[model samples]
Target chain A: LKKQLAVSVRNIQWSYGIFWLEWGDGYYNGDERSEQLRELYESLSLDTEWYYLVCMSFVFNIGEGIPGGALSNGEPIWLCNAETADSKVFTRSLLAKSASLQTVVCFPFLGGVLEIGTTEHIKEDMNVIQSVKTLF
Target chain B: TEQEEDLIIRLHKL
Candidate 1:
């Protein structure tokens, strides 16, 4: 089944931490997924604060097979960058390589801005993001 | 080596 939701992107802000995707609730510092997101945010090398996504509202696909935070009844919104196999693989590689180097994971919070009344309903959901693990 | 730096970074996260 396929369906589009009606939500709005109240705001789009990056953070140095991770938040839940379903029901949109959670903040992780070392969770595998969250850590992976953090690594991607850095690899971008885009002059931006840590990777933060302040999703006020965004239409997400309910039946498009949203991974990770997908609700049993409705699909949950997920950061797509982590969906692609290459991206996931690269992210994992980067994370593992990074871990192997024993680099300090000190992601700095660039900044955070909030908005109200933005509109971005649900859209198609992607696969769950994978965490890059390393060996001792 | 820079690789060492990267490893250090990961270790810091632990």
Candidate 2:
């Protein structure tokens, strides 16, 4: 799954992606050690973006961001334009803008969340998105 | 086109 995610991002012209599985109580509290989205796998087309994500530690809480919202609701979520989308829905809004990522899709399956980040908009990659969705 | 088709095939195999 990890290897394919790398390919999927490149094939679909996406910037980066991360897969997170619910852990512990599946909730986030004020503590930095509280339960949060824990990455099982991640891939990046841009080195800088990968570094930034790594630096930020990429952990998110339920309803805190796109993946969090999907995990919390047990539904698939798509963000077409990250920069223009509600800033509150993203963990690090500036990081997303700096990464040049626009479209994002989060799919929840079997307690795991699959997030795909793209440099293009959803209107341009519905087919690719659909194709990738089948993998989940 | 062929490459994408091949990748899809690989995906299914996985």
Candidate 3:
């Protein structure tokens, strides 16, 4: 099954020990984070004006790292309830009402995924999105 | 009309 896309916040307990990046900050590992985010958001182009999203890949717990767990590479990135449920739901309804935002893209990688135009890949998967009225 | 203007800006920015 194709995975649904969502704007997600990091799981404080399980997220990697990394600080989130700001608009002009040199945070995150590579340089492509901001570039990719802007491109993706523009391409998806939400139809209505009543949509906004907080895109982050760091723990909202403020200056916290993995909680005593040895992590492996490909551990299926974990998202908090807010990101998975709230943000995901918001995106769904927002997209349905507006034709402009055919999709919304969220950055999930530590680095460079955005620079490579991952939105092209994400946009290709149309089944993941749900219209707002249809959701209920 | 100010409220309507604000809503318009907010909606677009959102």
TM-score of chain B of each: 0.56, 0.52, 0.51
Candidate 3 recovers a fraction of native contacts equal to: 0.00
Which stretches in model 3 have alpha-carbon errors above 4 Å?
Answer: A1-96, A110-136, B1-14
Interface RMSD per candidate: 10.9, 13.5, 9.5
Q: Write the per-residue lDDT of candidate 2 for residues A1-136, one digit (tens) a residue.
A: 6555555565655555566723222211111211123332122211333322342334667786677888888877777766555456655455555556677677775467776665666664445557666653
lDDT of 3 by residue, A21-67 (tens): 23211112111443454455555546121222222222222121221
Tell me the tens digit of each residue's lDDT in model 1 across A1-136.
0000011110121122222223232233221544454455445434111212222112124232222213333322333223121322122223323222221121101121111111122233221111111100
DockQ of 3: 0.07
Query: Which candidate leads in TM-score?
Result: 2
Q: Give the CA lDDT, 0 to 100, for residue A46 in model 1.
A: 43
Model 3 chain A poorest ten-residue lDDT run: A112-121
TM-score versus the correct structure, for each prediction: 0.20, 0.58, 0.21
Residue pairs with clashing backbones, model 2: none
Error of 2 at A43 (Å): 17
Ranking by DockQ: 3, 1, 2
